[PDB]
Amino acid sequence: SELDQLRQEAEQLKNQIRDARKACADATLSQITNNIDPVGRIQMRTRRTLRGHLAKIYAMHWGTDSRLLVSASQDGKLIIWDSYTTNKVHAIPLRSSWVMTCAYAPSGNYVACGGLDNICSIYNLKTREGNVRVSRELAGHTGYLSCCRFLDDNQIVTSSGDTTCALWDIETGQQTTTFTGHTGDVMSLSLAPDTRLFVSGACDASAKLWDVREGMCRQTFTGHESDINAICFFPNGNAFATGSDDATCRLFDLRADQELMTYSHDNIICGITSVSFSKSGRLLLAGYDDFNCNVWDALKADRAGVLAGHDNRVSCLGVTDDGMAVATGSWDSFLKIWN
């Protein structure tokens, strides 16, 4: 028809949603959790440093078994670490060094990685010969793979340096769905633990929630001022943390449809590079520039501690499903395990 209709409807709907959010702020999270016990200092030590990546580490992911750790560095290695022992289980030579994302299947039978090649490469670890090989190259994205996460051995959700997310059937090597409403580059994903929803942080300062099966964006969270460079689900699946180059973190709850809490301090000009949660959700962990990880009480918005063992940008930050340990990658060669 005309934008003098369409975008006016869009404008008044956006005003109606902003009102529906504001009217829900019956109390802010701090007004409630002031009653809750201050967690104090969370002192944490490097229990392992994993050394052997030749180059800046860019992504890392725990397997479900909380023991094997995939880690991707700009040399073009996926190193699978026995975190209990520092033993390298595998070192996958990658067909293109500029790997920006990696994932470990919940089974542990597959690892995925990709980057500026716009390919997602699925490597099989279960092989009878014991040699890791490409199983599929998922090609059809039109910009760098920024995050990948397996739904199952046969399904993987991917995000790119384009407007879009996509879901892939690995065996058939094709998109089963594309998620398209994001305007900026989709920068980070996290799966809900039920594996039925996922949330996508993008360079347009918005987060969109996608029904994996339906393909529709159920909710669009916008309260950031810059790229949502990191995103993570709260372990109950009803809220998610959003790290951005605003140098702030924010906790968005799907049922509130609103930002509950913002984590910031005037000492932090540095952007937030990766976020994860401890198994309880009680600790929010954020990676930063100035080479530190800060640990936040997700309820109090209190800096319970810092992890300061790194000398370059904390590139990736992930917490085991059992909560036993926190891995921290850097643009240093080093991968340091904390708890």
């Binding site: 800046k56 860019y58 700009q74 980057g115 500026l116 716009n118 580059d185 360079c203």
Partner: peptide, 20 residues
Amino acid sequence: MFDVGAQRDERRKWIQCFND
């Protein structure tokens, strides 16, 4: 030498790869 073809016209979020 790396030519970063087929990218959506916005260097900023991939040039961080080519740091150093």
